[model samples]
Target: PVMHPHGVPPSHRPWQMKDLQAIKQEVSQAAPGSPQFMQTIRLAVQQFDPTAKDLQDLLQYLCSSLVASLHHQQLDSLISEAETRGITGYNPLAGPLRVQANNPQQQGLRREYQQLWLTAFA
Candidate 1:
């Protein structure tokens, strides 16, 4: 006899879009550039479903991690090119901080996403 008739445990249930969206907002509202907020972003990204491409801005923050990673790749390329092409003394890095500081909203999102990828899988 099946003592527990339930087929799947609550832990195994598929994540609903609503729950995903809720996490999105919660993590989004969390303090920018803080350790806990960053922690939330890291966990949330691991749970995001790529197939839900239509999740829009609600889940868009989660998706931005990809963009953030790719952007960093471009930055790496710039650095490599600087070395390969004999560019003078890290000028490419000049004012990099200023560029980030200039756009708080976009930059904050990028940092959350970028840091998550780095902290999680790195």
Candidate 2:
């Protein structure tokens, strides 16, 4: 006898592109240091699969993406401030205010190492 007629729970449904985009939008719009930001991710995991085997990796990726986005926003603000102060051009005192081409690659490597250290400790 099939006591439980319902097949699968709604919460356990497969994730779709729409759901992913919705979560991405929420994270992007929320403040990086705000509680809602973390809550949104937590809720996302609960909605998808709280017991997912790769949950830790998924969280790591989301947090890293958030950090990267925040860094970019900070850089953009700094550039705008520099332009307002007429410091965008070459300055003998401060040197070039522009970011070098290799800067991102170097920063990326550093971030990767930091993630690796976190993974090791985790």
Candidate 3:
């Protein structure tokens, strides 16, 4: 994955859709409204660049993630509740949580997720 503001390019392949899939699964598996669950979703939200499609897809994935552990039945009401009570409000995401440039193991994971993002946009 590309390091931010470091002028260093990734030495690995691009990101893929499956990365999001696993992320979505992790979110779904985490307990709803819990810190772990919220953090997981928040991290995924920050894993990519700012774009309409990227944002939309990630949000959609969140809903799908919630479907398995939904607190509400309707999508609209769920989204509304989420907006008020979810990470965007009570437990907001701070920033991107990708691999750090200095950590070899983390950077390796970042490379995979970065490649997934590239493929997602491409």
Candidate 4:
């Protein structure tokens, strides 16, 4: 009989810091709303925790970061240009963002949704 040597057995591998960094790099290189972008995001979510509700939270966090990074000067310039072009109600700096609705009820619902969204990150 030959003696069998014992060694460490392979098991499931969890994501590491380096793995997350690589995933971030890949995600950043992919265009937003593209198939590749969604694929990468899915992969990251799968690797992190497929069963958790983190995907929604992660996307919300990303959106907040994007909004926070907007250039105020550029925004003001764009708003001014729009106003000069006779675009009314295009000033985000003055009030909350708005969306066109067919009825007052729809507009009220949208406003409520926006408030909830703002509170989520605020």
Candidate 5:
């Protein structure tokens, strides 16, 4: 993130408040009171919404945060399963996921099956 203009230099760190201010300063210079400026504003918003940010980094952060919760639940279950199965160590991944359900259909795939199969087996 080496800021070339304004003598700010560059930085590898994630963009912060100063970055937003800098971005605004640059964007404001684009054809003020014109469609190009408005369109650029819209593009910026679509990219990262308010606060004038961009993509990738924002999306990656959100995706990573969601995975954190998933890791908590999945790792906890795996740890328990390993202990119960006397698995003392290694990762139990690689293999196909083993799923069990009281009623798999009730989990929302019933109608989906009707749409994709039902008649084939019937």
Candidate 6:
């Protein structure tokens, strides 16, 4: 009935971690001196988001995310992948891309067991 029926699997890229932190540091360093940054925040407040109403700055994040989602045709499967995310409410299953990851690790965290004995381990 809904999309991502299997689950929204976690994406991990170790190399990007350092760059992401550096970006945060760089943004924080420039925030006070950047007039455009302040103006941008003010402009964002004027355009409220449909889902994240409390924080209008979410528009910037949303725009950034959408832009990041865009990809070049470099990958062999790029066309197929692009066709996938474009699926709408009217036709969910018509897309050709295989969105559901069949790997077991993609299922995310799972509890190994429920404790049967409290004496063995606290």
TM-score for all models, in order of appearance: 0.31, 0.34, 0.37, 0.32, 0.25, 0.19
Better of 1 and 2 by TM-score: 2
In candidate 5, clashing pairs total 4
Q: What tens-digit string does per-residue lDDT give for candidate 1 at 18-118?
A: 87667868777867557777677555544542111112233344557675556455545543444456432223354443232223233342333333233
Clashes (candidate 6): 0
lDDT of 2 at 100: 23
Question: Per-residue lDDT for 1-122 in model 3, tens only?
Answer: 22244566433323457866767798788886677876666566456332323334555555665542332224334334434553221222432322131233344433333333332321
- lDDT for 77 (candidate 4): 49
lDDT of 2 by residue, 1-122 (tens): 00112574222233455766676787777876567766666566444432221233344455677665554455556545644665312243543333221122233322332222222321
List candidate 6 stretches off by more than 4 Å: 1-15, 32-122
Q: CA shift at 57, candidate 3, in angstroms?
A: 1.1
**Which candidate achieves the best TM-score against the true structure?**
3
TM-score of 4: 0.32
Mind giving the per-residue lDDT tens digits that candidate 4 earns over 4-88? 1357432223334575566668789888657777677666644443211222234434545565344233344443454456433
Error (Å) of candidate 1 at residue 49 is 6.7
Would you give me the overall lDDT of model 1?
0.42
> Please, what is the whole-model Cα lDDT of each candidate in the order they appear?
0.42, 0.42, 0.43, 0.41, 0.35, 0.28
Runs in model 5 with CA error above 4 Å?
A: 1-15, 51-122
Ranking according to TM-score, highest score first:
3, 2, 4, 1, 5, 6
Better of 3 and 6 by TM-score: 3
* Over 4 Å off, model 1: 1-20, 49-122
lDDT of 5 by residue, 1-122 (tens): 21223455322234566645655665576774366655554444333322101222322333356643453455446535544564322223523122111122122222221211111211
lDDT of 6: 0.28
